Amino acid sequence: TLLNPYFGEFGGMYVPQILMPALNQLEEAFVRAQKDPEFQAQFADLLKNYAGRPTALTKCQNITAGTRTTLYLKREDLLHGGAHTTNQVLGQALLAKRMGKSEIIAETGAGQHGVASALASALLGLKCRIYMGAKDVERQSPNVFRMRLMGAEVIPVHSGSATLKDACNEALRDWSGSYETAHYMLGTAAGPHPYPTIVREFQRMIGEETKAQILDKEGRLPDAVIACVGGGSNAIGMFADFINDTSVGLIGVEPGGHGIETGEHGAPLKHGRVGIYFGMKAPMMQTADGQIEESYSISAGLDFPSVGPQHAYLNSIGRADYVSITDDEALEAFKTLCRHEGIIPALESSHALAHALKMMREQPEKEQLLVVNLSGRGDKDIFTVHDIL
Amino acid sequence: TLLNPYFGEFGGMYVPQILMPALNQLEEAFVRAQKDPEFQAQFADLLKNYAGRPTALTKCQNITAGTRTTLYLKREDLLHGGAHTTNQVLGQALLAKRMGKSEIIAETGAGQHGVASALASALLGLKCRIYMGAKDVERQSPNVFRMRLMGAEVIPVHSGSATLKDACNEALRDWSGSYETAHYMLGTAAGPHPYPTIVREFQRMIGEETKAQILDKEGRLPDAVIACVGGGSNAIGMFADFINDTSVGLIGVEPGGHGIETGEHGAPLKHGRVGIYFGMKAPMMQTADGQIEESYSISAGLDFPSVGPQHAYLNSIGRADYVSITDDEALEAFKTLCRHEGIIPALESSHALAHALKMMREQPEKEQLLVVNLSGRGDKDIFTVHDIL
Amino acid sequence: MERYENLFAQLNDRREGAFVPFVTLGDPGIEQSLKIIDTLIDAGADALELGVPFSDPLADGPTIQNANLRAFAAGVTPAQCFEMLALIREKHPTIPIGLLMYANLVFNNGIDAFYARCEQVGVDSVLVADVPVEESAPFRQAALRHNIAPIFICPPNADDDLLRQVASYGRGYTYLLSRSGVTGAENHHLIEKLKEYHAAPALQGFGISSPEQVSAAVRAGAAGAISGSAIVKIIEKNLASPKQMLAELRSFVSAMKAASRA
Amino acid sequence: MERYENLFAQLNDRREGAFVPFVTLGDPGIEQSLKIIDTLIDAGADALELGVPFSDPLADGPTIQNANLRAFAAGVTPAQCFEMLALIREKHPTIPIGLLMYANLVFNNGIDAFYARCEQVGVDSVLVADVPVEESAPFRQAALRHNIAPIFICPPNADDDLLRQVASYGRGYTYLLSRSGVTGAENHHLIEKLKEYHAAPALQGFGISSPEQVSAAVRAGAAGAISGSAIVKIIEKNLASPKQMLAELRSFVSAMKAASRA
Ligand SMILES: Cc1ncc(COP(=O)(O)O)c(CN[C@@H](CO)C(=O)O)c1O
Ligand SMILES: Cc1ncc(COP(=O)(O)O)c(CN[C@@H](CO)C(=O)O)c1O
Ligand SMILES: O=P(O)(O)OCCCc1c[nH]c2ccccc12
Ligand SMILES: O=P(O)(O)OCCCc1c[nH]c2ccccc12
């Protein structure tokens, strides 16, 4: 290990011994790529001219009316593919071809990391197989065919519970065979080291563009930056450049589901027990005897029962607060952002927005500069939100 | 008229006399807004921070292999809403509120100008009714509900032939009543003066960003810039800053439909007769006795039977060439751009791309720097393209 | 040209007002449209306003749009209209016929050629619904050349410059718009100014329903009133009971013309 | 701890190889899993490798995944496994029992508490499938403290540093992987190096099917061979004909153990 695998006590590499040379090879690839000027040059070029970075920072002018909250939105919804997922996927596919690899495996739940792997492969000449589970295929059929058209194989999981959890597993099983030709493009800032670090370094631009943008606009750093937390990449993408600016609060929002008390939620970091799964030690949702229990959210992209290790760590030292938002409060903030600002947010990003609206509504005379990370657009979600009538 | 209504012989204002004060009021509003620094400041701010301009200029690295064609793509697909339509809609809604107006009428066929009117209204506090026709509602159901969620009224035309043609008419009928409260946000660079000029001045940034981008990248101006032509806004958006650079060819591409010879096409400028309709004198598709004949295209957004007057004029003086592309050649370039570059284009923009691929394929040793305007993304189209199997 | 001068001049002595019905040529069939225009005349119609079927009626709301759809199912082309028009004139040599047109239908095979067949068939005026005064020049010059009266609309929102223009350009009568919108059987100061400029006999526009509206229009200053909406609804209603259609038609025209004094 | 030393030491004199079957505890029901393990033993199984049902078998392909699903329908919890394990030992006091575990099941109520009930129940070794040598320390330290043999995997792609580590850490036997992937009944140099480092008796891994494969493994240097895939397929097949299941089981174990010399 050139880099440390642990964030306080969370982390590590709890993978079958056969995958261990694969992980240290990727860690070597990452470290040398990080120092290679031709890697960052190729990376930057692909972010600016193919993906469309920098994304905008929109001030809301109507939703905050009658309060003293100024609210900005970081526009990840305007990235090619329609979501933050693209940033990391470009960096890992250049790592994959730098390591002479030629197939790519990935897993997807909202379908959005599926589509971004499908597009980066077609761009770079890599072959791509994806695992996706049955209720997500259903909930996110838009993304199922975008993915298919770009020539990616959707291998439709229903080996047990058919969800992201199940896709994740199926993807690790396959890469336990394929690891010498194939690279595994894991979707979030979770799983075994160095994927928590690599996915964070490849999403870091989100938070460094926000810092530059707000300082030019407001002349001052936010009071809080808010982002939803499924496994943690967009949130750590956002939080990362601010961690040393103590003034700035970092709030991660987890799916509250039908409400925490129902048990049908997807909030491991504040309502789960630490466990060991998916190659890491991190809070998860498990039975009292330790079976991995499945989660719930109206949004497919936040339906994962564990969370990335750097988050479990930022909470324990109290640098970041994590909060929860029910299905209904996300749905209400989806409706309200359309109707007053003309932006249709992905239902995952609505969880972060519903928490910033709560903050503004509970204390209307509190002067506060907030930034929500609008991590995706809600085009995959419109069929689904319409069927809630 | 402060500005001239005619482009050579094409143009004018052939509207019922009652709408004539409305048109000269809008022309006054446009001219004074054009000189107002606070109008351009408000306009620019809304283009940069809400819509996400400048859009990128992507070099293709795989589709041109084996030829000597360098091909760039102007990324209008990355604009908020998902298409070039947004640029003009922001400028006209600031004109509408500058004239103290409060309702907005618009018509839509691919649904994309419907959605952009719906979002700009919600943003700016205007109320919005849209007319859309039956086969377009069907072909473009994605856009039907995005539009609906942002609180816009879709008034579903089937007063006769139910298409953009019919929507257009219905929209002018309503504005003949409403014109003192309501502004008509017309969708293309066609209809009565000053809408050909206003829509061109509000889409001009497309072509001025392309010029700055290619010169920095290539050190030289394109050999040709290519854009599809439904009524003509994205194409005149693109062509406009290049018209005086004679070196640069301007190619507009019209739907060839099932092929010109079938009669089921949508190519008025090269296969229609000049006529007078929708408030203008311009080439259209009409019966021998002068009934307005409907057009055809697999893409809803190019299914209009006339074309904007500045195009009919650029052709007659031979400054621009207009070409045609069948359904099948558009479908083939849709497939190929996904599979080799990871960009899913709107089926309208595929017509411009299929013509640049033809140019490259017919003459592989011709060294040529091209730019296609990728005017929209193809998310509205994936259900439709999948049902062609 | 001339037929209008006589009508308004003789109506003048009768201290009557003109009642001009509007009907789409061809709706619902040739033979039966022709019997509707004779029943109208024989019931008291002072002049006729006839529409030729256009596919995209920009200024026409639904009844007239359905009316057009009806002639179109009946097969009535532009040329079969002209064929009906020469037949109407051949048997009613004096009643003024005005045509309500859309611009493309006039432009199709030449503006001048259109005014020429109008003159050949014995039509008196042509109103082109979508050519405003500021685009009228080739249309008004071609009509004057074939002794066809160029009709113009004077809308509610009219200003002086326009009122003097339409007074200088029009002939036959002035179409004075009494509302805004598009045609339907649902939904004074200007007239004096017209008469100051010496404009043609203003007849009243869209939104005439009331028998007493004619009366009102006449004493308000208008020389007559045009109605189409009403006339067509009946054609649409009693279309299954043709004789009854003719009958209720014969009734409203008599009924409306009877109200044409005040 | 000890049971393994005796087995390999007495197998040594017999110039036999070990044949360790693998079975999921609970599949398809408690009583009937227990009759499968007695039939295995009584048919020639030298040691047992037993799996406790985990929901997310990362290293297990489909048969074992279905097997887990089966115990889960049967209601077999972690605690009913331990209850079965003390019963197996109570009647078969000498056969070495190794447990195939996943990390969360061990971590749940404390690593040390887990090794403690293992010791209390009379289990000999524990293999934690997803804890590599570099994360093993609290697991191997807790097992040594309760006289539980810490089993490690030595994969195809092994290097020296690893081979010396697993030789220094493991006890009981070494699991030598003969392929890559996840478990299924489809799909020499290392052994000498192990024996140079003085590692535990290497038994062979995934991908043992052939009766002669055991033979091969034994003379190639491996002290025995583990099979699960095969064993389970039969449980899945003859599940409707229980007696026949037992019978074909009794056959393969006899058949495979019969091949355990070369
Ligand atoms: C727009 C958007 N924002 C956020 C998330 C949640 O992940 P994040 O926690 O990693 O940042 C998702 C899910 N992304 C994964 C998991 O289902 C995918 O495969 O689609 C998303 O769809
Ligand atoms: C992405 C895209 N590109 C181009 C066009 C064609 O129009 P343009 O000729 O005006 O530029 C359309 C259609 N735009 C109109 C007409 O149907 C709308 O209401 O949706 C489009 O959908
Ligand atoms: O209100 P109504 O239906 O009585 O019609 C009015 C009569 C003439 C008329 C019929 N259609 C038109 C289109 C434009 C301008 C005038 C007309
Ligand atoms: O190839 P098979 O099916 O014979 O199984 C191999 C036996 C032990 C075994 C069963 N499941 C595991 C998961 C990880 C590591 C080893 C195991």
Ligand code: NA
């Ligand atoms: Na989670």
Ligand code: NA
């Ligand atoms: Na067209």
